[PDB]
Amino acid sequence: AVPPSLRLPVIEAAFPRQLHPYWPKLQETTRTWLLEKRLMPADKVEEYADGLCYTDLMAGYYLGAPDEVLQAIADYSAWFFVWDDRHDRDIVHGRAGAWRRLRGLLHTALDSPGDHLHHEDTLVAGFADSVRRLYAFLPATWNARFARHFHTVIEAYDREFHNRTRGIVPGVEEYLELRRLTFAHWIWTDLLEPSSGCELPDAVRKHPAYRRAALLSQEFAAWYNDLCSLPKEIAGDEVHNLGISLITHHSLTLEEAIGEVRRRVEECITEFLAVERDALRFADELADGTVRGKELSGAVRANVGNMRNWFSSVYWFHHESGRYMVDSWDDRSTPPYVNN
Numbered sequence: 001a002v003p004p005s006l007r008l009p010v011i012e013a014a015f016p017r018q019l020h021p022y023w024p025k026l027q028e029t030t031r032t033w034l035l036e037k038r039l040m041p042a043d044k045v046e047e048y049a050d051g052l053c054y055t056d057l058m059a060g061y062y063l064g065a066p067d068e069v070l071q072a073i074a075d076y077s078a079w080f081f082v083w084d085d086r087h088d089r090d091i092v093h094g095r096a097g098a099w100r101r102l103r104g105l106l107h108t109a110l111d112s113p114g115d116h117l118h119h120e121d122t123l124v125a126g127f128a129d130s131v132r133r134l135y136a137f138l139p140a141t142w143n144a145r146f147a148r149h150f151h152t153v154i155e156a157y158d159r160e161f162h163n164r165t166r167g168i169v170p171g172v173e174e175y176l177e178l179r180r181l182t183f184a185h186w187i188w189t190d191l192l193e194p195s196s197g198c199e200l201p202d203a204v205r206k207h208p209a210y211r212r213a214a215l216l217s218q219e220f221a222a223w224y225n226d227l228c229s230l231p232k233e234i235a236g237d238e239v240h241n242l243g244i245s246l247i248t249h250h251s252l253t254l255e256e257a258i259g260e261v262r263r264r265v266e267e268c269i270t271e272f273l274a275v276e277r278d279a280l281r282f283a284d285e286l287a288d289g290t291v292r293g294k295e296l297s298g299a300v301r302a303n304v305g306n307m308r309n310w311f312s313s314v315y316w317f318h319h320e321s322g323r324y325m326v327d328s329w330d331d332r333s334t335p336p337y338v339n340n
């Protein structure tokens with residue numbers, strides 16, 4: 001039973017879950033990779049990695065991906081979680097220098113990953129490995145777009161570092177802009193493309209219905225993370241959360257803030273249902289009888305299908321993953337799967 005404050009009957013009824021058939025291999029392979037790259041200690045991998053459900057999250061999202069693509073995505077996603085953990089720990093421990101250096105290394109590695117495959121910081125080496133693999137599926141133009149987007153993400157993490165160090169809780173609109181970057185909206189949207197085997201031309205992926213469907217899928221996911229992760233975040237002195245911005249700047253109680261975030265999440269769902277009809281119409285229109293049109297149609301249709309799958313995968317992930325089980329920790333401020 002999903003807690004009533006977090007339950008969304010529309011997702012439960014109208015967004016049936018899907019699971020990629022590679023998932024059981026994926027679970028094992030990403031666990032092995034976390035170990036091999038030394039991204040988490042062996043005993044914590046053994047106790048916690050499967051329970052974190054990071055592979056499940058991605059296997060419920062990128063349906064139809066080639067197995068090798070899903071593996072690179074899942075390893076990169078598990079890396080991304082560990083990076084969120086490292087960032088958090090650097091802030092909590094006041095490691096401004098170590099964070100600045102990591103930030104610079106990630107920008108460099110993102111542009112030249114093969115050069116960093118054996119870097120002394122295993123977090124940089126693990127990033128480089130996953131990124132090098134992601135850069136092997138589609139043309140350099142897509143790689144450059146992924147890099148452009150992720151440079152922006154790294155800087156949004158840097159902004160979060162300074163917000164937390166200075167005690168600043170962003171305003172509501174400032175936060176909503178920032179959250180499109182810290183949640184990596186455009187990275188997940190970029191990754192739809194190797195998942196369906198096609199770098200989409202700008203004129204296709206920038207079609208207003210494709211853009212809007214892509215945006216709403218990520219806003220839902222990010223704001224639903226905010227709703228579910230709020231208790232762990234308050235316990236850990238995290239300030240980045242739509243609920244915390246509302247409590248801090250709109251004088252809402254916790255109860256009022258939860259309700260307002262819920263209402264925003266629910267509106268994303270029904271806005272998405274409306275634009276999804278337009279995005280699927282567009283997919284149909286691309287199928288103009290030509291070979292290229294059939295390719296583009298199939299790719300848009302698969303991508304929009306996965307924009308829909310993200311709703312259910314993210315919904316259930318928050319109820320299944322050990323990541324958010326703060327009630328089970330002895331020290332609510334220190335999740336047991338993080339390196340403290």
Ligand SMILES: CC[N+](CC)(CC)Cc1ccccc1
Nearest residue numbers: 080081084182183184225314
């Ligand atoms: C640290 C969390 N994460 C992805 C690694 C950062 C972009 C956002 C996220 C949280 C929960 C579900 C899906 C994505």
Ligand SMILES: [Mg+2]
Nearest residue numbers: 084085088238
């Ligand atoms: Mg976090």
Ligand SMILES: [Mg+2]
Nearest residue numbers: 084160182240
């Ligand atoms: Mg974060």
Ligand SMILES: [Mg+2]
Nearest residue numbers: 225226229233
């Ligand atoms: Mg969160």
